[PDB]
Design a protein around this ligand. Structure first.
Ligand SMILES: OC[C@H]1NC[C@H](O)[C@@H](O)[C@@H]1S[C@H]1O[C@H](CO)[C@@H](O)[C@H](O)[C@H]1O
Ligand SMILES: [Cl-]
Length: 485
């Protein structure tokens, strides 16, 4: 029965540390976290904002508010998942507060605007630095990858005691906007709204030069980005690229989609190699976040996945390539949409979150990875919780031992007073009993081994072998066998 237990984590508020890098919510959180403990919660997740910590200048790390926050988490007796948040808070759905990346990094952009992901009209997205500059020493002598590595190293040295005490158990490495390994292909600030197909955000000069070099290297130096792709708010049928039997199927289109999605995979791999070196020997799991682009999943072109950088089609598994890249690092996948049913989505959007969830979870498990999930949108109701329960144990309870597959964890978005009062709290507490297979809370479940060094580097051609043949997902039960009631 104990093999069935799934840990439950709760996301702290976006301003758990204030926008001025001070810890102001000690009284409120102490109460709120006591309520989470009373409900059997295993831990919390928190954004560790680059903009707050390295805000005053290069290598001026001010960890003191996060230390106060983390002491409080420890005193409550909860585990902790730390996100290395190298992105801006703001513009993305649910972001109530405003925390840019460091001002001194933005100041570099006033001279070299190509440090930012750039769209086809030339608009600069300031939420994250382009993967184009991962290895370009533009930031007062440092590259973007060096900045990320130094930040993680300073985190390790400063939070060593929380690491040694087994409080911090997971490091989620932010790899893009909203901390997700993707391009900013659906930005509300540039006028996108649901369920627009999005746009390819590869027009910064660094990525343009990368494309020309890749194209010349296959004997097509003339080739350019596709220009029959429409705009943010189009539907697929209204573009020659994404329509049924469109130019996404051409040799040119295929080369472009591979190049764009490959760069994301290489960005993840490089950064995970550095993260693994940092946390070598500590009892933590490294994780990445894959964004849940469920819209247009039901049409042949998977348009919105393609623009986000996920090269996923009926005969090409664009998530198992990513999982295969992660395997050498023993990195986990944190996914989203665990609370969503296809019947809750609008028809127009051609949306299939249930199938997308099944695809990504099955890709992780086939590669031997731990897989965790989050809810995409706020939900307080039994149905949502039952949908999560189904995804947490897709073949139900195993009475003899553990089930064939299960989530390694589930993180709930997001803590507030609303969660810990009234009927909301009764529902949530019941949901946590069910995720624990109705057993008491066990702080020593899922012990981590000392992080081993990443295995040998494999090439992009080796990673891409996972794309085909595309396999059906493992069968999922329609409904959980252990509902909230
Ligand atoms: O948690 C990742 C992402 N999953 C899909 C949800 O719809 C999004 O709201 C979240 S992003 C959100 O929360 C993150 C973790 O607290 C932040 O890093 C990010 O800035 C927020 O936009
Ligand atoms: Cl296989």
């Amino acid at each position: 029965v104990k093999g069935n237990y799934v840990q439950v984590y709760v996301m702290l508020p976006l301003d758990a540390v204030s926008v001025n890098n001070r810890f102001e919510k000690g009284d409120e959180l102490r109460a709120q976290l006591r309520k989470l403990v009373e409900a059997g919660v295993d831990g919390v997740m928190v954004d560790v904002w680059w903009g707050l910590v390295e805000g005053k200048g290069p290598k001026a790390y001010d960890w003191s508010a996060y230390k106060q926050l983390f002491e409080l988490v420890q005193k409550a007796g909860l585990k902790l998942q730390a996100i290395m948040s190298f992105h801006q808070c703001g513009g993305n759905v649910g972001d109530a507060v405003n925390i840019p990346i460091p001002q001194w990094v933005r100041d570099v952009g006033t001279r070299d605007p190509d440090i930012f992901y750039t769209d086809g009209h030339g608009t600069r997205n300031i939420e994250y630095l382009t993967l184009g500059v991962d290895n370009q020493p533009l930031f007062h002598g440092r590259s973007a990858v060096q900045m990320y590595a130094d930040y993680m190293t300073s985190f390790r040295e400063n939070m060593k005691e929380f690491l040694d005490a087994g409080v911090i158990v997971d490091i989620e490495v932010g790899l893009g906007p909203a901390g997700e390994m993707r391009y900013p292909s659906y930005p509300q600030s540039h006028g996108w709204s649901f369920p627009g197909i999005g746009e390819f955000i590869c027009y910064d000069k660094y990525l343009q030069a990368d494309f020309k070099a890749a194209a010349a290297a296959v004997g097509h130096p003339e080739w350019e980005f596709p220009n029959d792709v429409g705009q943010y708010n189009d539907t697929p049928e209204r573009t020659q690229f994404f329509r049924d039997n469109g130019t996404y199927l051409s040799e040119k289109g295929r080369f472009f989609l591979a190049w764009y999605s490959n760069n994301l995979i290489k960005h993840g791999d490089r950064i995970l190699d550095e993260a693994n070196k940092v946390f070598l020997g500590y009892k933590v799991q490294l994780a990445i976040k894959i964004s849940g682009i469920h819209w247009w999943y039901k049409v042949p072109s998977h348009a919105a996945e393609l623009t986000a950088g996920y090269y996923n089609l009926h005969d090409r598994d664009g998530y198992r390539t990513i999982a295969r890249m992660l395997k050498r690092h023993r990195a986990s996948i944190n996914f989203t949409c665990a609370e969503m049913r296809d019947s809750e989505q609008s028809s127009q959007a051609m949306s299939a979150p249930e199938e997308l969830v099944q695809q990504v979870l099955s890709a992780g498990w086939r590669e031997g990875l731990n897989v965790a999930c989050e809810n995409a949108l706020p939900r307080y109701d039994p149905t949502a919780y039952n949908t999560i329960l189904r995804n947490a144990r897709p073949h139900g309870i195993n009475q003899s031992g553990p089930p064939e597959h299960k989530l390694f964890g589930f993180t709930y978005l997001r803590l507030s007073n609303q969660l810990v009062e009234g009927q909301n709290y009764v529902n949530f507490k019941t949901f946590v009993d069910r995720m624990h297979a109705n057993l008491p809370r066990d702080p020593y479940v899922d012990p981590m081994a000392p992080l081993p060094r990443s295995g040998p580097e494999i090439s992009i051609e080796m990673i891409l072998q996972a794309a085909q043949p595309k396999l059906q997902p493992f069968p999922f039960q329609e409904h959980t066998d252990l509902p909230v009631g």
